[PDB]
Design a protein around this ligand. Sequence first.
Ligand SMILES: [Zn+2]
Ligand SMILES: [Zn+2]
Ligand SMILES: [Zn+2]
Ligand SMILES: [Zn+2]
Lengths: 335, 335, 335, 335, 59, 59, 59, 59
Amino acid sequence: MTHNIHDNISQWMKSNEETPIVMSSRIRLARNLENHVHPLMYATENDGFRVINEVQDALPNFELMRLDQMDQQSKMKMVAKHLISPELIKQPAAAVLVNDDESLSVMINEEDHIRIQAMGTDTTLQALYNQASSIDDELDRSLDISYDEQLGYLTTCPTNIGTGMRASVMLHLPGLSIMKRMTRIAQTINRFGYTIRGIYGEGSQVYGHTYQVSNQLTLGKSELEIIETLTEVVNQIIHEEKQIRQKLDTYNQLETQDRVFRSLGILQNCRMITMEEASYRLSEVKLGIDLNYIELQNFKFNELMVAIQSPFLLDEEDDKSVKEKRADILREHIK
Amino acid sequence: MTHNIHDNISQWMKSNEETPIVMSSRIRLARNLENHVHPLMYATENDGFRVINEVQDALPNFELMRLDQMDQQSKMKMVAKHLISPELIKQPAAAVLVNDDESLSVMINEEDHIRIQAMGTDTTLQALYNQASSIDDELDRSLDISYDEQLGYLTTCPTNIGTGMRASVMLHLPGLSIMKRMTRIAQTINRFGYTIRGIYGEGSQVYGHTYQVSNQLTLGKSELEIIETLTEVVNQIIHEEKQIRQKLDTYNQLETQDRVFRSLGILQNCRMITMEEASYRLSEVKLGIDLNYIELQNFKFNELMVAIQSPFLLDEEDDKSVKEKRADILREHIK
Amino acid sequence: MTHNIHDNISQWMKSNEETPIVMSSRIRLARNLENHVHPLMYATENDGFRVINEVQDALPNFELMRLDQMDQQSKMKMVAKHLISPELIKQPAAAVLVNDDESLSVMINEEDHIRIQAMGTDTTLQALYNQASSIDDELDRSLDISYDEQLGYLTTCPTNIGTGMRASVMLHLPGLSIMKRMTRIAQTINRFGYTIRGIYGEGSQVYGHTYQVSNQLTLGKSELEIIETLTEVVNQIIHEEKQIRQKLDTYNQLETQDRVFRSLGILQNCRMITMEEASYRLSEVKLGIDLNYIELQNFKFNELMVAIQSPFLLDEEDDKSVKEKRADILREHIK
Amino acid sequence: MTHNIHDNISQWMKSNEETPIVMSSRIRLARNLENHVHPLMYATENDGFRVINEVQDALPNFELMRLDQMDQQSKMKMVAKHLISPELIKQPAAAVLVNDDESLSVMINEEDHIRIQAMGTDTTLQALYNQASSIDDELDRSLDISYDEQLGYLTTCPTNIGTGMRASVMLHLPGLSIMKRMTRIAQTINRFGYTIRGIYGEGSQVYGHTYQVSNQLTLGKSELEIIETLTEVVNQIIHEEKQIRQKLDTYNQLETQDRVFRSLGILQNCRMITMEEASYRLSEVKLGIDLNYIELQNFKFNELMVAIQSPFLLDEEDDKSVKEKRADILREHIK
Amino acid sequence: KRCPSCHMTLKDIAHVGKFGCANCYATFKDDIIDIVRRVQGGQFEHVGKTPHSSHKKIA
Amino acid sequence: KRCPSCHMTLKDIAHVGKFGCANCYATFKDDIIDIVRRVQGGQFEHVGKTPHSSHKKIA
Amino acid sequence: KRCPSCHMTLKDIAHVGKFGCANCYATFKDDIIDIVRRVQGGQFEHVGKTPHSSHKKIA
Amino acid sequence: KRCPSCHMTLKDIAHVGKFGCANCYATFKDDIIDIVRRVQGGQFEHVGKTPHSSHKKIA
Ligand SMILES: [Zn+2]
Ligand SMILES: [Zn+2]
Ligand SMILES: [Zn+2]
Ligand SMILES: [Zn+2]
């Protein structure tokens, strides 16, 4: 019916079994604009149209998808794909540029920037940074940006002054969460001045299923320094996660096998599944496949996670048939 | 794996889908013996051997299975098939006669009787009564029983004086138990002076899965009267159960379908199933087979309910592998 | 606040500490009437007025309280005092006679009778029976009742043909209910053909706080026989309840003392108490006083259990202030 | 029973009703020593005795309490008073100096320092800092410390290089914890690079009852800067906590009054109280006292929370007799 | 066929399972005793209470 | 006083509430019928099963 | 006192805690560097990214 | 290569991540300042407390 269960295929969704504890990576580049009076603080459509036209003819190779011609359905469909933040949809003058290959983006007039964002492969952040640089030469060549010499760029005070970089990684951590080993390690990582963040959906998931780590200070430092710091801090948490995974496999094995197979059995053949349960059960069956037990998707985990959200279905019927339809797609795509 | 898996086949286990709320029927005939001093109150083996030899040569067509040559394993294996009561195994002088066709039995020296018992088909109790009568002519012809004229036979005071008859039926009542409609109807049936009894195993099952109805006074009445009274009173509860089932099928249908299929999914693919859960889940899937939702066999369910008990398995290993083996046989025979 | 917290005083509410497991006793006398066409099956007010006037001038010493001049508040206030059954209030032609001393009653035109009821002291049922007989001489002297010789009186088929007697006792059984010893003993007492019944309020109380035992067959027997049978069946249970109490007092004593004092502490100082909790807590503190631990102000347990019901309070405000007021009267009268 | 229910009286335990959300304050001063080879990495008693004698005759006005002459009972009794950390008791060469007035301390040979600690009043941290400075003049005058010019002092790498200062505050935050407003604000305060810490006892208390805020970087900064920063960051939270309290008082008031008084009622009259429950109930009654509900005493809250600890009772009797002793001292001191 | 006083069929009173009046007994006593015996055990041999007015005159 | 065959007191068999043998009936039938009537409703009028050997000869 | 381009008071931008334009820096840089140092640790010594157009001509 | 006073390798003190004595600094200060800068933000520019005995004589 709906066309958002295979139109996403990429390397980062496909080749994620060798290092299954990492899911994707982000990098941002926030920078303001010259010859305009605070692009967001305004009264009318005019500053919006001016900046929109400017950035539009600045690069004819891309295509636009404005806020005006979009109903709420497509808006949330694109929010749940991580291409929008809410303050964009709250902005009548806002817009978005994209690449049809769908590896880069530009959130025009979102909040005090243009924000060349780039999500992508799992191999290295450096290739993504190089692609964003190969866009940045063109942009800063075709126009003058509000650069400073004492400081670096000049975007917004508490977030980005030195450089607009902000990198992040998406992590799947079930073991330390079933064993209650996240607050201690959260303090351990806050020791340096980094942070660990929530999930796809609700920021109250106790059993993990996903996590996100990011930096805190893009101030008074270079780029590659923060890159290598985050990369080295992420090899530690992957190491600690794989320590509680071999332990459980050799030590008990039976409570593990029981939980895993029981959740797989509930998942198919339910017909009435809500959200929380489907998420939890999916994390558990994936853990099972990581320990070589069952043989299922292993590349459609992220695609199901991103397809089962409510605004993909609620916009057609009331919620009581939406439960049936969610359960139907789960039962249909698992086996 | 165990012998019970298929060596029991009979009409009452096979053709039980047209009227699936009835499972089997019982009739007893308790009567004491003459020229012996209270066959149970004794000191030595001698009264036991005398009565045993007497009843043995009284009918050479049958075969014996004594208490002495049997270990506890076979003892409980036969108790869980409803051919023994505990006070028989508590009796060093006790014994049992059988029929290899396995439709009749005689519990020699059990408690104040010989107790020609007969279990069997679902069509009518009258055929079973006629078979027991066609045994009784031979027995009372070959020997003199302690008969009286003012009273009838003479066995034991609070239970059987008039005649030794005691009939019973085995009923499967899930609907009234999920709806909490058993105490009221228990009072309703006690209005007349009858009783409703427990189950295969534990007498604390709240969700039904089985029930048993029996008489209370085999005193000062004929036989066919009580037969027709029990038959008419059991027709009432079978009729009350078919109404509420139709109600649930036409009214909700979705909570029903959910519970049923979810329990079926847990049942296979668990590997660690205890007793209570397997019983409950079996009752639910059987209800769902009757509401025409799934498939599977049905004679298999009587065999399973009688095969999953612990003393069939505990006598080989400790309980922790017994859980695994119970789950294995369930997973193997369901699908 | 309500005048119904002391206007009831009697011997049966006062001297109930020596034998504290008994609360009160009942006896009924149901009998129909001559020269009238089935006093209840009618179309208009006329049969009601005729029978009402007849029984009214039959005994001028009493006073009437009709159904017409009473609002629902007073109706439920008198129902919760055990002087009415619902089919009386469902009857537009119904009425009630009383005695201002409030030890006897007559439910005119309730259901197929006049039902001289008599509740009272704890010493003996015989004094109450004698009082009802000293009323019955007058009634059957002033008028002709539908008496028969082969049968006795003639009231209604499944309930009262021989004589209209139906006796009952009110019992407080917490120990056997905290220990799950009520279904077994219910079967034990049903062995004879008697019954055990619910409570003040809801017939779903698992922890006791009250119970009621009654007869089943007032048919083909005398009166004193049933009196002595019920009396002897109630001496057995009180003896069973006094054994387990001594066991708990000498064996643990500390879980007991903890539960008791904790419930007493919750009871006062709550301000927001619903029904179930107040009942449960009251039973527990009474058990404590019976085991001679707490010695508090008064022992109006009976007045409280009959005063805390909702229709005494709901008829003034919505339920949310009724909770406050119930808690207020509890906190005020306990200590 | 124990002498440790009044021998602690001080200003910080007494005058804590004006600002009841603050409980006490800490400051540390960690600094190593010269002419000794890493005072902790050693083989024998000798370095311990040398440093102990040196610091002992360095200040004759104080008194010693060594590790050797102390049994485990007194050791834990002093640990639960916040004068010891575990690595001190794990050290056979360790010792402790004190002041009998009990406002200052010195943990000789604890871990890479001597650690002049000072706990005290609620008015200001500056008076405590001045007292520690008026000790530090004497100590650094009588001996040469391992001072550096490029860096400051020189104690230990990840904790204290610049200066040994580490300040902290003890906070009581029930409202934001019953309302689930602690993870968000934890991220908010980690924004700057500070931390919020656990409690008296277990670091798994979800409903608050206590919290502790501390700094993270005593590096490359002055002293008064960090003092003022922490003061302002802890003044932001006391306002947030005082704002939600007024909300709950004016908005509901009845759920609040119910919970408070119910917990007070359980607290006295229980006789069998474990740890978690007594803590929770104490926090709730204190919240109530702040909304002006009860009288009793309130300075004792500080002593009661440290006295119910296991070591003050468990060292003498079994844990079940200690449940009864904790309950005895709770029921006793409250009212 | 109906009752003289109630004018009510006896299959009707069997359906509700109740009792019309004394005339209903006088004309349906066979079925009444039959059903009383069938339901309430087997004790249709009934002794009632010693009445007052009848024997006041007859003995 | 005891039974001929069992040599068991009748207060004893009353305590266990059981039945010794035919001789116990032949010597304690009064109390036996009494207690059967007292407990099992009131139906001490007993009709048994049509036997075989007795009437095979007596009718 | 206000900004030339935004015409916005600096207590105002302090209240929202935001940044108007380059002119706001050119006229309020003292307070800007002050608050950046006060909040974001103490690292007001900023090295940015190697720009393009500036040093395309200046070096 | 070892310390004069502690006689402890600097890979060893790096493993435990600790500090031997003043001599360890005097001979390993390069790596010490390096790791302090690497971990504790970037604030290796350290101002300590105003000491007593040093300036008591030097100023
Ligand atoms: Zn009639
Ligand atoms: Zn005998
Ligand atoms: Zn401006
Ligand atoms: Zn050294």
